[PDB]
Structures are given as structure tokens and as C-alpha cells.
């Protein structure tokens with residue numbers, strides 16, 4: 001039953017990641033997972049409840065992958081870490097599974113309140129940390145941390161959404177990246 | 191029947207603006223508007239369809255109010271547009287219908303679609319003129335517009351639900367002024 005929970009999250013994540021929430025039902029997910037409908041329904045009351053758990057694990061991975069790519073950049077100063085985090089988010093957003101589940105399905109299925117709540121829970125802390133360190137190093141002017149975090153999260157989430165539905169995503173990714181890099185380079189002292 | 195549409199949009203806008211979408215039903219709106227439920231349902235199949243039309247009219251007005259406040263260099267217009275948006279988003283009716291109810295009722299796809307349809311043109315124009323005047327580096331116009339709209343919408347949402355909106359408006363204003371002053375040349 002713990003095993004059943006895990007198999008259901010993994011199967012849902014894989015299938016919904018490829019085909020989207022709308023295109024795969026709970027019976028096909030149960031078959032994929034090798035469990036009965038009665039065991040599925042004991043763990044998840046409906047389609048949407050399984051999807052909320054798929055979103056948590058995917059967002060968990062998005063954040064761990066973000067932290068990995070910033071560490072991998074070899075950013076010495078906070079300013080460079082900030083530059084590396086921007087690039088990392090555009091990299092990770094571009095992953096087809098992240099695009100489908102987080103950018104496209106999640107806002108529709110969780111609704112706005114649910115989606116914002118999740119997106120804040122996973123993003124705010126990293127965002128505030130990067131800012132706080134840049135301020136401590138003197139690479140960013142002292143200013144209210146939470147409001148700047150919030151503004152950057154809005155800018156970066158919107159970037160990702162814009163690329164996700166672009167006629168030409170490779171162009172939109174490059175252009176949006178340049179525009180973010182310029183904005184950041186005008187804010188940062190170093 | 192255009193008249194019935196107008197009466198219904200005004201009544202909806204007034205009542206939902208005071209009490210919020212969730213707290214007022216369509217029958218009370220029909221009574222407010224001076225029409226029968228049958229005439230309302232001929233024009234709007236449900237609650238949400240009336241709300242989409244309330245959003246259009248309100249956003250139309252938000253944009254005209256924005257253009258009015260700016261017209262009262264391109265770089266300064268950009269700074270004035272930021273102030274103007276914080277001014278007009280602070281309006282209780284705009285706060286309730288556009289910042290709070292619209293993303294819930296339209297969804298994010300619908301909300302972004304509306305917000306871009308009304309905002310993009312002004313946003314692209316301000317950018318383009320700042321580029322022409324040499325106050326902003328030449329760079330892709332649509333992607334910058336898009337990023338600014340996201341930042342500014344999120345600013346307004348942050349203020350709209352702040353524990354202390356007067357504090358959050360001042361702090362967020364400073365943070366937006368800094369962001370903008372880094373985007374602009376001088």
C-alpha cells in the first residue's frame with residue numbers, strides 16, 4: 001500500500017508527462033502501475049488528488065535540479081549564482097515533463113490558488129536566499145527581500161510560460177534569456 | 191438587448207466589485223440591473239460568462255486610465271507607467287475583480303490571455319520608444335514586454351493580498367523603481 005502509492009505516483013508522472021493530464025485516465029494508470037482500482041482509490045479519492053501528489057514530486061525535482069545546476073556552474077559570488085539560477089530555470093522549464101505537468105496542466109487542475117500556493121512553497125526560499133546573499137556581499141542594494149523575491153518569481157514564471165507556448169520556443173528561450181540577463185546585469189553590482 | 195447586456199455588466203461590476211464574485215448570485219444581479227432572469231440567461235448562459243464580460247470592460251477602463259495617468263522622455267513615461275499601475279491596481283474594484291476573482295474564475299490561461307491582450311500594446315510601445323530615444327538597449331521587444339507584465343502583475347497581486355498593503359505598496363514601488371532603473375540607460 002505504501003508500494004501502491006509510489007507505483008501510482010510514478011506511473012501517473014510518466015504517462016501524464018508524455019500525454020498530458022486530460023489524455024490519460026485513472027484506469028490506465030492503475031494498469032500501468034500493476035494495481036487494482038480499489039487499491040488506487042484507497043490511496044487517492046480521484047484523478048485530481050493523484051495529480052496534486054505528482055506535482056509535489058515534480059516540483060521537488062525541479063528545485064533539486066535547480067540547486068544542482070547552480071552548484072555545477074561554479075558561481076563564486078552571489079551575483080554569478082543569480083545569473084546561473086536564471087539559466088538553470090530556463091533549462092529545467094524546458095524539460096517536456098516539467099512543461100506539461102507544471103506549466104500547462106497544474107494551473108488548470110489545481111486552480112489558481114492551489115497553483116500559486118505550490119509554486120511559492122517551492123520557489124520562495126531559494127529566491128529569498130539568493131537575494132539575501134547578494135545584499136550581504138554588497139552586490140545588490142539593500143531593499144525589501146520578500147517583495148523583490150516576489151517580483152522576480154513573477155518575471156521568471158512568466159518567462160517560462162511565454163517560452164512554453166511560443167510559436168518558436170528555441171527563439172523565445174534565447175531572447176527571453178538575453179532579456180533576463182540584461183535586467184539582472186543592470187540590477188547587480190558585479 | 192445591447193441595453194440588457196449593458197445593464198447586466200454595470201450591475202455585475204458594481205455588486206461583484208463590492209462583495210466579490212463568490213458572494214453575489216446572478217439573480218440578485220438581474221434584479222439590480224432591472225431585468226428578468228429569463229432575459230439575463232438569454233444573454234449569458236451562466237455566472238462565469240457574465241464575469242468574462244465584466245473583466246473585459248474593467249480591463250478596458252484600466253488601460254484608458256493608465257494612458258490618462260501617463261499623459262498627465264520615454265524613460266520617465268516608463269517610470270510614470272509603473273506608478274500609474276500601482277495607483278490603478280489599488281482601486282478596490284480593480285483589486286477585487288481583476289487581481290483576486292479573475293485568476294480564480296477565468297483560470298491562469300484565460301487570465302494571462304486577457305491581461306496580455308490589453309497590456310501588451312502599451313507595454314511594447316513604451317519599450318520601443320525608449321529604445322528609439324537611446325534610453326533602453328536594443329533587445330527583443332516582445333520578450334521584455336512579457337517579462338515586465340509578469341513582474342508588474344505579480345507586484346500588484348503581492349500588494350493585493352499583503353497583510354499590510356500600504357507597506358507592501360511602498361516597498362514594492364521601491365523594488366520596481368530599482369528594477370526599472372537597472373533596465374534603463376542614463
Ligand SMILES: O=C(CCC(F)(F)F)N1CCC2(CC1)CC(c1ccccc1)=NO2
Nearest residue numbers: 062082085086089102119123127130156157
Ligand atoms: O519552481 C519554480 C516555479 C514553479 C512554477 F510552478 F511556478 F512554475 N521556479 C521558478 C523560480 C525559480 C525557482 C524555480 C527561482 C529562480 C531564481 C533565479 C534568479 C534569482 C532568484 C531566483 N529561478 O527559478
Ligand SMILES: O=C(CCC(F)(F)F)N1CCC2(CC1)CC(c1ccccc1)=NO2
Nearest residue numbers: 268271272275288305309313316339342343
Ligand atoms: O493591465 C494590466 C494587468 C491586468 C491584469 F489582468 F493582469 F491584472 N497592467 C499591468 C501592465 C501595465 C498595464 C496595467 C503596463 C505597464 C508598464 C509599466 C512600465 C513599462 C511598461 C509597461 N504597467 O502596467
